[PDB]
Every structure is written in structure tokens, then in C-alpha cells.
Amino acid sequence: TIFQFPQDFMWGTATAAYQIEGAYQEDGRGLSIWDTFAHTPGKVFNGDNGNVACDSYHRYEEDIRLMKELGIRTYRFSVSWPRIFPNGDGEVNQKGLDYYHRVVDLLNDNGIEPFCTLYHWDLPQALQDAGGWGNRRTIQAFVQFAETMFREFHGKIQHWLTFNEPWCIAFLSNMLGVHAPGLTNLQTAIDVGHHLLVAHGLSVRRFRELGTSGQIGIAPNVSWAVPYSTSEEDKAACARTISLHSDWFLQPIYQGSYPQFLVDWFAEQGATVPIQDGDMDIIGEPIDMIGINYYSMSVNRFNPEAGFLQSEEINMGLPVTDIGWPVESRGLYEVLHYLQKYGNIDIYITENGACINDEVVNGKVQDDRRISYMQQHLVQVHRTIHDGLHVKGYMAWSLLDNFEWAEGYNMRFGMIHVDFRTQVRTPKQSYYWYRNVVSNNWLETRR
Amino acid sequence: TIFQFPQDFMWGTATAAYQIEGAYQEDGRGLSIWDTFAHTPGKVFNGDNGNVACDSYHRYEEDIRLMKELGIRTYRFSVSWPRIFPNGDGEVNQKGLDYYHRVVDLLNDNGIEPFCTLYHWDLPQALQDAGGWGNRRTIQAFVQFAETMFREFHGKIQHWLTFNEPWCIAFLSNMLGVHAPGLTNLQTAIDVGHHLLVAHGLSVRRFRELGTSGQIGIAPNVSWAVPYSTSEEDKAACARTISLHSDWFLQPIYQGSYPQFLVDWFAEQGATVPIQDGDMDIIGEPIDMIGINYYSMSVNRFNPEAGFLQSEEINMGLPVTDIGWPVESRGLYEVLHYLQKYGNIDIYITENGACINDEVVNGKVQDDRRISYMQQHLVQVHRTIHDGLHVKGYMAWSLLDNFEWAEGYNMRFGMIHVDFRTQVRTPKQSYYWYRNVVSNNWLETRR
Amino acid sequence: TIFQFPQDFMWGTATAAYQIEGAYQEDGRGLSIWDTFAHTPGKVFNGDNGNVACDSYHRYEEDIRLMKELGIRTYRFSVSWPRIFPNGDGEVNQKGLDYYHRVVDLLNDNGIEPFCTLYHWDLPQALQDAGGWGNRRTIQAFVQFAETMFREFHGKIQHWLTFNEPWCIAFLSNMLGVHAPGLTNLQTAIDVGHHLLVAHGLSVRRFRELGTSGQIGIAPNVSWAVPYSTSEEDKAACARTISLHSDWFLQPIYQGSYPQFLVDWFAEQGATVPIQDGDMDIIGEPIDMIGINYYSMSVNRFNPEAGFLQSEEINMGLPVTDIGWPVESRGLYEVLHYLQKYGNIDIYITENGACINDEVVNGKVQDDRRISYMQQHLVQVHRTIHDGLHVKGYMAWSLLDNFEWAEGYNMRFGMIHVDFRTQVRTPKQSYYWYRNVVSNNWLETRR
Amino acid sequence: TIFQFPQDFMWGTATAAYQIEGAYQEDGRGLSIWDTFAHTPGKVFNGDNGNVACDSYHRYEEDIRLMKELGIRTYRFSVSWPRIFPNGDGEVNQKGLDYYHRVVDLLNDNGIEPFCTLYHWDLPQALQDAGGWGNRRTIQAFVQFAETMFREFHGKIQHWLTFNEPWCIAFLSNMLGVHAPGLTNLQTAIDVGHHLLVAHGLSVRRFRELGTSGQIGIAPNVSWAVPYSTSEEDKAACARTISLHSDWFLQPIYQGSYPQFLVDWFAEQGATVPIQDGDMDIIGEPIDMIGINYYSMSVNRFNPEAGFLQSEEINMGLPVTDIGWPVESRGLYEVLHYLQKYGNIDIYITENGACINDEVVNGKVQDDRRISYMQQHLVQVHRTIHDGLHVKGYMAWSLLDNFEWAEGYNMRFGMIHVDFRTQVRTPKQSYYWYRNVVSNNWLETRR
Numbered sequence A, B, C, D: 001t002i003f004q005f006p007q008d009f010m011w012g013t014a015t016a017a018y019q020i021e022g023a024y025q026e027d028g029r030g031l032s033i034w035d036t037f038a039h040t041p042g043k044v045f046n047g048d049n050g051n052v053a054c055d056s057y058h059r060y061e062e063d064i065r066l067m068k069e070l071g072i073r074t075y076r077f078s079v080s081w082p083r084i085f086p087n088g089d090g091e092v093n094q095k096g097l098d099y100y101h102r103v104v105d106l107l108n109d110n111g112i113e114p115f116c117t118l119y120h121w122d123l124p125q126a127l128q129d130a131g132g133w134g135n136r137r138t139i140q141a142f143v144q145f146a147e148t149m150f151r152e153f154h155g156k157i158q159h160w161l162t163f164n165e166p167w168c169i170a171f172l173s174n175m176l177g178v179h180a181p182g183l184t185n186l187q188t189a190i191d192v193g194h195h196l197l198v199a200h201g202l203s204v205r206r207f208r209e210l211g212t213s214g215q216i217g218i219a220p221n222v223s224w225a226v227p228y229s230t231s232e233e234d235k236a237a238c239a240r241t242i243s244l245h246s247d248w249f250l251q252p253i254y255q256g257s258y259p260q261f262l263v264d265w266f267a268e269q270g271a272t273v274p275i276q277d278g279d280m281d282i283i284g285e286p287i288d289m290i291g292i293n294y295y296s297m298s299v300n301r302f303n304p305e306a307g308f309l310q311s312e313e314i315n316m317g318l319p320v321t322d323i324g325w326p327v328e329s330r331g332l333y334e335v336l337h338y339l340q341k342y343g344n345i346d347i348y349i350t351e352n353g354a355c356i357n358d359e360v361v362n363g364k365v366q367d368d369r370r371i372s373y374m375q376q377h378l379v380q381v382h383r384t385i386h387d388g389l390h391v392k393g394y395m396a397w398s399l400l401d402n403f404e405w406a407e408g409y410n411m412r413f414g415m416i417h418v419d420f421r422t423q424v425r426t427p428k429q430s431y432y433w434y435r436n437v438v439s440n441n442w443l444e445t446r447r
């Protein structure tokens, strides 16, 4: 079947600073909570870390030349906060700013629109030392960071995102302890989530006050769970799973309150949202779009022993990618329609991709399963657009094989293979497949 | 995840006469419409036919020994009508009856319950010569065939099905011309469908009058289509696709009328159901269960040019089996719940399986994709039972690689590989996987 | 180096009933706790069980022909208690006795000395229903079982063992829950251990009173741990690890008391040995030899969080077999010298072998790592004999690939490969290597 | 298990001049006894020699760039005596000095601490012509060589070793004839050993008098033998084996006498140590640390026919590296504790590695057995540190595949593969494994 995309559909790829850049000590870069985390034995597989990574601090010109031949129109990347403010400090590091000017000017030179993520998880350790996100002073620190970027790159960047995946920053990181700073305390995860939201609202307010160029949003990762039974309990468990990812952050922003179930759920667990006067108004600051990050879908049932959400995922026997995630693309269609409760808002898919670990064989990377994955999910994108939803663009995750957080370098998401021994880039078969789709601006599924 | 099945859950496998038996001219067997069809150039791939097939006319003792070591409780097979009545004639062939007594006694000897399909597509050619199913005299001919079987095998067979897949017999065979007798006429397909239904009702009536042992039903193949858009037209197109397979046959049987939309749809195309006084009452004869035959699911949209149902299937990019069908097991869960409109009736899954063409390599058939397929679909079966639906059993399609109708021998569905050059059986890896599940009476999905 | 063994050194192989026999419901066999355990979802990998196994209930004549061409002098096997007393009942099953007469007469016919293990873990479920080993009535039940065997096979069997691996029966099974009946209660594991010992003493007493032919002992599995540090705590942790396997059972038998440290350790955990008047005298019944079961060695340190013995094993980086055990044969030499605290007693190595999962390739099983393993351990055997220790024989574990308890059939220990789909035996390369050693009665290590 | 190393633990790699440098005739280099030896038919396998080798005389900048990306803190190398004094002559060769200034300045430029071995076996042939090490005039010649180096490289080198492996220089070379100059005379081996020791003491005395920068020691290779029996004779044989490597050189240095047993043993063989007045005082000159060179461990027994030490090694069946040595890392732990008889002295492991002959395949060297070897031995290092022993650093043997003395180029020890046809370096998989360990400063053993 032929799937023709809109003329002005925005095709891109996405990375994050700590996952690709390397040069973790170079040019006065301070340490982030992820440096600290990855430098701690037992936290990241094999003790991998983002010292070096893809060395994109030095190799960005090649990366941009490769993405320019991909025929892509955006590039989503994030800013290393501790390159700009090494202690989250108000003491600016000009060399850090100079790096992003080099990147952004190259992008703009190549007709590729920067899509800037300000926060992709690298809180300066200095700020974490004071309580980092659980401390409201970090709010003010973020707003200065954001403001500095808005002022420096005014007119060079037209698409901004405050935070990438608040659910991970808050709950995966501070309740489940899986990501830096690796805490396991409900109240702290709720505190972090709330303060992210206030810092987000204040940054969007500053954006507006400054008259900064472009449009600004936030990029939640988005859950989809479907009940095993037709029971009310299984239905409830899926609602909790879905809502904590998206609604818990999106209902404040759009509708001015946290999801009351969940507030009630967490209250049963003795945790309350630290809401201060004025906070909810700040958080409801109008935004221009959202980014949605999507990989997977699950079938869940109520289980009292299944974690703090008491929602158990059933292994339905589906095939899985090389990191263990089932592929079921309908979940993207379902959650995009779900999110229309907030209106027909502008949505960019700011992360979608698969861990497929194929290496270079006879000079190429025959990653047919990544093509298959992307094909399936791009059909759903077309499908939602054709239902009239304002889905504006799609960013493949990831340009490059990179540091996959707690999995280290073992789990490859790139459309370009990186040999971490040599730093040699080898575009995979999915890169050429994707080059054709973005260039043609249509997709064909064939037998 | 562990999926524990009911204590009295009925595990089996399924074949059909013309697909396995061979000996097509032996012991006075008359020709069927499928002999004729497969003997016609251009109808079946490579000119394959069911002369010989798996030679199960001669090798049934081995087949039963193999299925007995599978640990199975039923075996679904069909009766070759032209072995019993070579001209559909009232002139019985005792040698034909003797074959099925040999099979049935062996099954019963082995503690394996016969599950008898009377009609699995092999209408005597003699009857087709007079109009075959479009001629009401074929109704009377079928009822005598059914009656003969009820009388002969009374007390040896406790599970009966009148017809396997009426949609195929009627629409695939007489509208789309794909299966014998290969006609392309809407009115004839509707005539055939109606007369099958009357012949079904009359046979169930005779069953009851005779006091034959056991329970009797009918085994539709079951469609599931889900709309591409949220549009009313796409929704309509899926409704037509779903209903022609199941409702068109099941609404007469259960509720006493054909689906009125569809009646109206076909009337626009100038075809009317040849309903005679008393017909609908006959068809509404109470039955004890149904068999459901399921493989696949589709995403459809309205398309004026997409065949007589104007319903186009979208290639969504899903992986497909070796015959080209996508695997999406949720469709089984969905259609089973759909069918509850007729009440919580007893349902056996009387056909589910995958075309996976792996051959013997180092003495085994490493058909991991067939295991994967079956795993997925057995989860859904468990899922519906746990929703309280009366799903009573599951028959894997197929015991043996066999004659796959218009595809010939090219398309292998068996859990046991058959080398058609030698007739050597080699149980595939899925056979041993299935032996464990049926024996344990639980399934585990693992990473 | 050449290693010449004593003229009268006893070479053999070893199996256990539930691991090889199959026919779990045949001839009135009752269910054991391992039938129950393996039939419980989640207990054994893949839901494997010992229904069928190697089908040695039917195929014992082939097995004996194969072991007879191995040139072996003993065969260690165990008696399925529930074949003899299906409810542990006093109601004898003659068909069960007849099986072991068939096996034993064949062995004796072939000049192969039976080495009979009475208890290799298959307690009748009927007895477990009353508390099984935690209930002193099971003591009396075992003594009748033992007595029945002594009386029936008097003069046909000259080597007897009461219990195989008391540590597993007691602590692995009732404290760690890993083996049937899968309990996790210190007091119950101590109760079980104590009652095994009383049942052992009473059986040896009956043996003597009856004048039964031959010699009788018990076959502990034997731990060896060596401390990571030179610290007193690490030394203590290794002492606990070593002593619970051997001394906890051997000090009662030889010296008339339980190891006082350990008694004190378990008392801190609120568990006491249920010692009744007369018990310790019973347990100290003189025995003729012991069997030692050995696989592996560990380097341990004190760790408060490392289980009920607070003894942590360090992964020292050694290569491991396919079940994950490091090979360090010196541990056999060390523990044999350790056990001289009980005097220079007669010791048979009644189990030593490796899980090496090589399959049949070009008609053979090239299990070089199993040869390597056995070579290393047979050097140590020679080494202890040459130090003057009365090590009398060696039984390779196992004749056949078999049901490896909680690992199921996945973990192969056999010197003969069994295809569980066909039951075809294929002697591995280690079988022919071993045939040469036992026949020559010397070993050569070569570069 | 995680094994965290001390913050200031010194990671390195090690080479020797004649094994890597090549340019054997360049820049006025005189011939050494190893040039002569390797140029003699029958002495070195295949007639390989150290003309050319790794050509590190020319390629040192690449080697240093590679070791700098390894993240290493030291580099142990040796000085070619005949580059500096071609006839061992007092006539200095400035071009020879200039080479080591180029190397050392590059190392220092790269933040890599030189660890200088003065004598790694390349005695000028001119000196051997006069009796070479058996002649006391060679003592004086060495002290001038050492003094020249101390004076030239003062302040550029902070770690010095006088002699690498005195046991090899003396006994392997002059008793067993295996290494240059290939003599077989006990008295000459004892003479050589004694004179090495005097030359060592005098050089350390000069070091002190000059006020040279850094610390100075000597680097014995270290034997470990464990007795086959518990017999006094086997115990004696192991004591001789252990002591001739270490104690025979270390007891003079630390305690002021040769091991009296051994003195007595050699006296029975008619050889006496040529001790002159003042000699033992000279040899007892205080040193700052020792280097320990370790590969392997053995199980030995007394055998009258087993060489001049009458100590036979038993092939215990252990797997071996590609040069034929068994790997048993506990020997490192054992001998380090053994050496505490001299006090808790500072010990660097100045050579540990494995001959693993894997070549480049698909662009990499998959030397998993070298990683396994190093893993095992680094656990023991951690283990001794944690026992409180002052083990200060670890140098992998070897940076590069090189000339392995009598084995020639056939036996590869490198962490970087060298194609001797092209001189192309290819870092092996162990190089990247090691880069991670040294950089993280911890090791993890995993299943």
C-alpha cells in the first residue's frame, strides 16, 4: 500500500547529549548525575559510561554531513546543561556555548532545522548535591539555563522542548532507581515531577517574555496499556499505567490539575504533591506543541504485587526487539487518539525506533528488522494524519548507535552503526531505506 | 507468563479428507469437484492435486500413533462424501464406510475422540453436474449422506460438524472462483450459501430424530477487520467483511434471519436469497456448539473498487507467514467477544495454524515461527476463557503438511513434516512444543 | 603423566530412578513429591517432568548392554520408593519389585555389581501429605521400605546406600525451596535432616539384624569452600558452608553429635534439632563406607546478607560448565583429606561429572570438555589413593543424559546422549575415552 | 562480583628491548648475546630473531599513542645495553641514548610514567666474549651502564629495576642452556646469579649516592609449586622449585644469605657460590620495591631423574595456553603471601599475561581466552590487596605481540596484534577489555 505524507511533514532524527557527545571533561564541562551514576559500579551494564561515547563533541561535522545526505529536515539534539553551567551555577562556560553555536550554525548551513531539547537528563551533580529536582532552587537554576539558551540562540533555533520524558526523570529515576540519580522513594519522585513542571512553566513564560524565536513545548514519553480481562480492576490498572506517563504531566499543563485518581492512589501510599500557591497557574502556561516519545504497547492486568502501580504486564508471546520490547505499532495510533482529550494539539513524534543489534557484515548492516519496525510505525503516523490529527513530524531514534543509559553500548538504536573502537560510522540498510522515504515523502508496504 | 488451561480443555489437531487421504480412485471412490478442479490446468499451483497427498488412506495407523504420542484428546477429520456415495447417489459404497470405521475404531482404541466434519468441500462431481449446491436436490442428497453417517457411526463419534467454512464453500468458490467449482456469480454464491444452511438444519433435525450420540454444530471461518479511519464508510466496510464470514451464516442459525445490511447490499447488486417457505425455520434448528476457524486479522478501508464488498485491506507492514498472512492474534480475542451477540455459546477453535515452510535439516524441522504463532494464539484462547467465554477446545491446523488447495503442496501447515516423495513423517519442533503444552495443560511465554 | 589405578579399583556410572525411568504411572507406581513438584507450574524449567525421561523403565536392557561394553564394574541406580510402596503404605507393589529384579538380574548376568541407592529423593506424595520427613512416621515407613528391599534382594546386591545427598533432601528442598517439596523453613529442614538420619540408623540396624549380604553406607554431597581473605569471619563462613553438607550428617553418624557451631548458629535463628532419647545412639550405627558426591569448589567470604549461612561465593572468573559451575578439581583432593577427621574410612566417589551440552554432530558427540573435566578429577582420585586414603571406586555421573531436576532436560550430564524425541542413545566421545581408562585401569594426561 | 581497586593503583603494560625494537644494527648498536644466540641454527624456533621484531625502534610513537588510548599510567620497557655501550665498553653511543630520550619524553608528554628495566637479557656479546657474567669485570661494566642511565635520565624516570628475572639469566641460560648464552654448567649458573646480585647491589648504591630521582628495585620471576603427595620428599622438591626462583635472589638482598638448603643441595653437586669479602653486604643494599613476574603454578613431586632440582611437574590435566602453560591464578595469591617472609614490601606485578595465538578475523582479534586469563589473575591481585599486602600495580605482558625468545614470533602475548609482514598493529579484544578495567579502576566477573 502507498502511504503519501503531507507536503510539509517534518522528517528528522534524534540524539541526546550524554549519549553521543563524549568529551565529558573537556572545555570545563562539569559532571552530571549520569556521569556520577555511570561511574558507580553496578549501575550501568559492564560499567559502560558516556566518557567518549560517539565522540560527537569532536565528530559533529561528519554526523551532520551524514544526516544531510539522509535528506532529513530536522535534527533533534539536547544541550548538556553542565557544559553551559558546570555547577548549575550562573557562572557561564563560554566554551560550552561555543560548541552548540558550531553545531547549530552547521545545521542551519545545511538547511536542517535545530530541534532543541534543553533537558535530556544531565542535571549537574552540583545541583544534585543540594537535592537536585527535589529542591525548588533547581527550578530557578533551570530557568536561568533555559533563559541563557533562549538569549544566546535566539533566531537560530525555532523548535524548543523543555524536558524529555518527565516520567523517566521522576519515576524511573527516583522511584524505581533505574536511571540517575537512582533513588527509590515515591515522595521524591512526585517532588521531582512537580518541580520539573514548575520549571517548565517558568521557562515557557520567560520564552514568551523575551520574544524568543520559534515554538516551545515538552516531550513526554507515552505509555499504552490494554487490559487482559474485561474486568474493572484490569481497566483501572491500565489507566494508572497510561496516565502516569502522560496525563500526570499533561493534565497540569493543559487542564490545570493532576489526575485525581493517582493523586488518590499516591495518597494511599502516603505521598502528596508539594503544590505551592501559584504553582498550578505557572504550569498551565500555554505551549505550542508537544513531542511524543513512543516505542511499545502492553497488555496489563491488576496485580497487588506488581509494583507501585499494581499493574502487571503480560508476556503475550509477541516477538521482541533486541532490548526485549514487543513491537505493536497500533499503540501509537491508540495513544495519539487518546491524547485528543487535550484538543487537536500539534504533536511531533520526537522519538521512535528499535534496538536491533546487527553489526557490519561485508561492509553493511543488514538491519531489516529496524526497517520493518519503522515501516509499521510510519503507517500509523500516516493513519492518524488521515484521521485529521495534527501530527507534524517524525524523528527516528537514533541517528547513531550510542550510550543507551543503563544498558550501556550493548543496545544499538542507530540508523548509522558506530564502531566504538574506531568511531567509524557505517550507515545501516535502514539509513538508505529511510533516505528514500523522507526524500520521496511517501512509504510503500510491499509483500 | 504462565497460562493454565481448564482441566477438561480439549486439545486436538485437524485435517480434511481431500488434503491428506490420497487413494482418490481406490475402492470405488467417486470424483469430487476438487478432483475435477485440481485436474484442470491453471487452477492449482504447479498442477498439484490430491491424488496421493499424504496417502493417509493407507498410512492412517502411523498418523494415529504419532497423534497419540502427541498426547492429544481429539482428532478432527472430514468424511470424503464420494467415498460413501460416489455419485452422491443413495447407492452406498461399503468400502468407503469401512475405511472410516477403521480410522474411528483406531482413534477410539487410542483414547482419542473423533471430531467428525461431514462436509469439507468435496461435493461429488455427479451432483455438481446437476448444479451442485445451487440445486436444492443437493440438499436432500446431503441429508442422506449425513443420515448414513449418523446411523453407521452412532455411538462411536460424539462430536459432529455439518459444514466446514460456509463462506469458502459459497463465496470463495462461487463468487471469487478461487476454490472448486470455481464460479464467479454472486447469485450462485448466495444460492449455495442458502442451500448449505437448509441442508445443515435438516441434518441437525435428523440427528435429533435418530437419537444419534453426541453433539452437533457447524464450523464457520471467522473474519476480523478493523477500520483504517474513524470514518463511517471504513466502519461499514469492516462490518461487511466481518459479517459475510460469520453473521451471514450464524444469524440465520441463531436469530432466524440474514443480516439485513448485506441483504440490502446484495440486492443493490441484483442478487436475492432464494428463501422458500419453511427454510428459515429449518435453518434455525438448535445446535450444541460451533467451531470457529481463525488465522488472521486485517485493517480495512472503504474502496469502491475493492471487490464485491468494496472493502480494501491495507498492508500495515506487519510480518507475514510463508503464505503471506500477517499474524495478529488479538483478532481471535476480538472475534470471540464479537460472537457473544449470539449468547455465551460453546465454541471450539476447530482450525488455527500457520504456513511455515521449514524443511528437514539435520534430522529436524526447526519451525520456531510456528511455535511463536501458536503461542500467541493460545494466550488469546486462555484470555477469552478467563473472560468467562465457553471456549472448550483447540485444534491445531494441521497434523500433517498436506494439499493446501489452490496452493498445492507448496504451503506447509503441518506440525509433522511430510516428504511427499517418500511419504516419510518427521515431527517438527512445534510438535514437541505442542506435546508439552497439551500434556502439561499450561503454556509459558518466556523471554 | 601416567596415573595407574589399584587393581581392584571399582569403576562405574550412576543414575537415579526419577531422572531416567519414566513410566511414572505404569504398573501401579504411586506419585512422588517430585512428580507433584515437576507438575507444578514455575518449579522446573520449561515445565519439564520425569514422565517418560529416558524411558529406562522399558529400555534398561539397552542401557545395560551399553554400560557392559563400557567395561564398567558397578552401576549405581536408585529404587523408586513409590513403585514398591505406592502410598508409602506397607501395601507392597509386586510389579515394582519385579522391575528391579529384572534390572538386577541383568546386571548380575553381565558381571556388573549393583550399587543400590534406596532413597534418591522420590518420597511418596502420600507420605508428604502427612508431613513427609518432618513427620517421624516417615522414619518407620522408610525402614519398612529398606527392609523390604534387603529381604527381596538379599544376595543379589552387595553395595547399599540409604540416602543420596541429605543436604539436598533437607536444606535445598525445605529451606531454599529449590527441590521437592520446595519448602522454605529452617526448622523444617533441620527436622527433615534429623529424621533422615534416624531412618538411616534404623535401616542399617535392620540390615545387620537380617544378615543381609554386602556393605551399607550413606552418600552425602560434599562442599568445599576456601576463604577470600585471611580473616576469621571468612574462615568461619567457609566452615559453615563445608560443614552443613558433610559434617552435619557425618558427625552424628561417626562421632555422636551435631557440629556444635551450627547448632549454635541455627539456635540464633530460632531452630533446634528435634533430638529424642535414643536418637543419637541410633544414628551412630556403624557403617561400612560412605559415598561422596562432588562437582565443584568455591571461594567464599562472610556476608550478612548472603543467605542463612551468611557465606557469599565469589565469582573468581574461572571458566564454568554449561550449568554454570566452575571446575576446580583440587576441591576433591582437599575435601577427601578433610574427611579423614572421621578416620581413614572407605569412600566411593558415587557422583562426579559435568554438564556439557554438546549434541550429536556428524554422528558423534564431541564432548571434549567432559573428558577434560573427568581427567582432572580422576588425577585427584589417584592423588588421594597415593596419599594412602581408602578411596575405593569412582562412578561417573551420569550414564545417560537425563532429567536434571529443576533444570529439566536442558542440562545434559550423560556420557551417552539421549535424544528425548526418539529415545535414541548415542555414546559420546567421553564414553569411549572412559571405556579406555576403565579397561586399561590407568589414565594418561598429555599435551 | 565487583572488584574495586585502590585509587592510586598503577595500571600498565610491559615490553623488553630485544623483543620489540628491531633496528639491531642501526645507529651503532652492538650485538648482544641474544643476537648471537638467535643467529645460531637450532637455538630459536624457525631461526626467528630480533632483527626487525616489532620495529619499535622506529614505530614507538604509534605504540605510545595506542598505550595512551589504553588509559594506562605506566609503561615498563627495558634499555638495550649494547645501544648505549656497544662493546659494554665505557665508550658511550649518544645515538642510543637519544632513542630512549625520545621514548621517555613522549611517555612523559603523554602522562605515562616510565618504568625502566635496565637489564632484560641483552648482554653485549663483547662482554660475553670475556666470560659474560661469570667474569666479575662484567659487574663493573653493568654499574657504569646503570650509572650512565641514572645520570642521563635523572628526573625523567621515577621507577627503576636492575634485573628482569635473575633465575632465567642464571639458571635457564647457563644451566639448562635454553636462553642466551645457552650454557649447561651449574657452577657457571651460580657464578652468574651471584655476580648479577653484586652488580645489582652496586647499582643501587650508586643510585643512592647520585641522588637519582625515584625508586629502585629488582624484578624476579616467581615460581609456585604444590606437592603431589603429603610426603616430606615432595614437600622438599616444591621448596627447591619455589626457592631457586625467588629466595635464592631475595634472601641475599633482604636477609643477607643464600637459602642454606640449596647451598647444601648445590654443594652435593660440587658447586659453590663464589662469595668474596664484602659481597653479601653489597647485595643487601636496601631497595624500595620489587617487581614480581608470574604466569603459572605447578604440582610437583620428588623425582631423582627430574633435572638438577629433582622436582617433577605433574600434568594434572588442566587446560593450557597456546605455549603450553596451565592457568591456575591462585598461585599468584599463594606466592604473594609466601613473599611476606621478607616483610610487607612494595610489590608491583611487572609481568603477567598469556600466550593466546588468535589472529585478525573480520578486522578483530577475538582473544577471549586472554581476557579470561587476565580476569582470573586480577581477582587475585585484588584479593591480596584486600588482605593488606602492598601490591601497588599491575603490568600486562605484553603491549605487543613480539619476539618470544626461543619460541620466536610463533607465540603471541600481546594485547595488540602485530602482523610481522606489514608491522600493522590491531588492538585485540583484550585491549578494549583492559581499557575499560584500567579506566573504571574496577573489574566485574559475570556469568
Ligand SMILES: O=[N+]([O-])c1ccc(O[C@@H]2O[C@H](CO)[C@@H](O)[C@H](O)[C@H]2F)c([N+](=O)[O-])c1
Pocket: A136, A137, A138, A139, A140, A143, A144, A198, A202
Ligand atoms: O533571578 N532571580 O532572582 C530569580 C529568582 C527566583 C526565580 O524563580 C523562583 O525560584 C524559586 C526557587 O529558588 C521557586 O520556588 C519559584 O517557584 C520560582 F519562581 C527566578 N526564575 O525562575 O526566573 C529568578
Ligand SMILES: O=[N+]([O-])c1ccc(O[C@@H]2O[C@H](CO)[C@@H](O)[C@H](O)[C@H]2F)c([N+](=O)[O-])c1
Pocket: B136, B137, B138, B139, B140, B143, B144, B198, B202
Ligand atoms: O427421502 N426423501 O424422500 C426425502 C425427500 C426430500 C427431502 O428433503 C427435501 O429435499 C428437497 C430437495 O429435493 C428440498 O427442497 C427440501 O428443502 C428438503 F426438505 C428429504 N430430506 O431432506 O430428508 C428426504
Ligand SMILES: O=[N+]([O-])c1ccc(O[C@@H]2O[C@H](CO)[C@@H](O)[C@H](O)[C@H]2F)c([N+](=O)[O-])c1
Pocket: C136, C137, C138, C139, C140, C143, C144, C198, C202
Ligand atoms: O513395625 N513396627 O511396629 C515398627 C514400629 C516403629 C518403628 O520405628 C519407630 O517409628 C517411630 C515412628 O512411627 C519413630 O519415632 C521411632 O524412632 C522408630 F524407632 C519400626 N521400625 O523402624 O522398624 C517398626
Ligand SMILES: O=[N+]([O-])c1ccc(O[C@@H]2O[C@H](CO)[C@@H](O)[C@H](O)[C@H]2F)c([N+](=O)[O-])c1
Pocket: D136, D137, D138, D139, D140, D143, D144, D198, D202
Ligand atoms: O671506575 N672504577 O674504577 C670502578 C672499578 C671497580 C668497580 O667495581 C668493582 O668491579 C670489580 C670488577 O672489576 C668487582 O670485582 C667489584 O665487586 C666491584 F666493586 C666500580 N664500580 O662498580 O662502580 C668502578
Ligand SMILES: *[C@H]1O[C@H](CO)[C@@H](O)[C@H](O)[C@H]1F
Pocket: A016, A019, A164, A165, A293, A351, A397, A404, A405, A413
Ligand atoms: C527515548 O528512548 C530511547 C531508547 O530507550 C533513549 O535512548 C532516549 O534517550 C529516550 F529519550
Ligand SMILES: *[C@H]1O[C@H](CO)[C@@H](O)[C@H](O)[C@H]1F
Pocket: B016, B019, B164, B165, B293, B351, B397, B404, B405, B413
Ligand atoms: C482452514 O484453513 C486451512 C489453511 O488455509 C485449510 O487448509 C483448511 O482446509 C481450512 F478448513
Ligand SMILES: *[C@H]1O[C@H](CO)[C@@H](O)[C@H](O)[C@H]1F
Pocket: C016, C019, C164, C165, C293, C351, C397, C404, C405, C413
Ligand atoms: C548429584 O548431582 C547430579 C547433578 O546435579 C544430580 O543429577 C544427581 O541427582 C545428584 F545426586
Ligand SMILES: *[C@H]1O[C@H](CO)[C@@H](O)[C@H](O)[C@H]1F
Pocket: D016, D019, D164, D165, D293, D351, D397, D404, D405, D413
Ligand atoms: C617474562 O615472560 C614473558 C613470557 O615468556 C617473556 O616474554 C618476558 O621477556 C619475560 F620477562
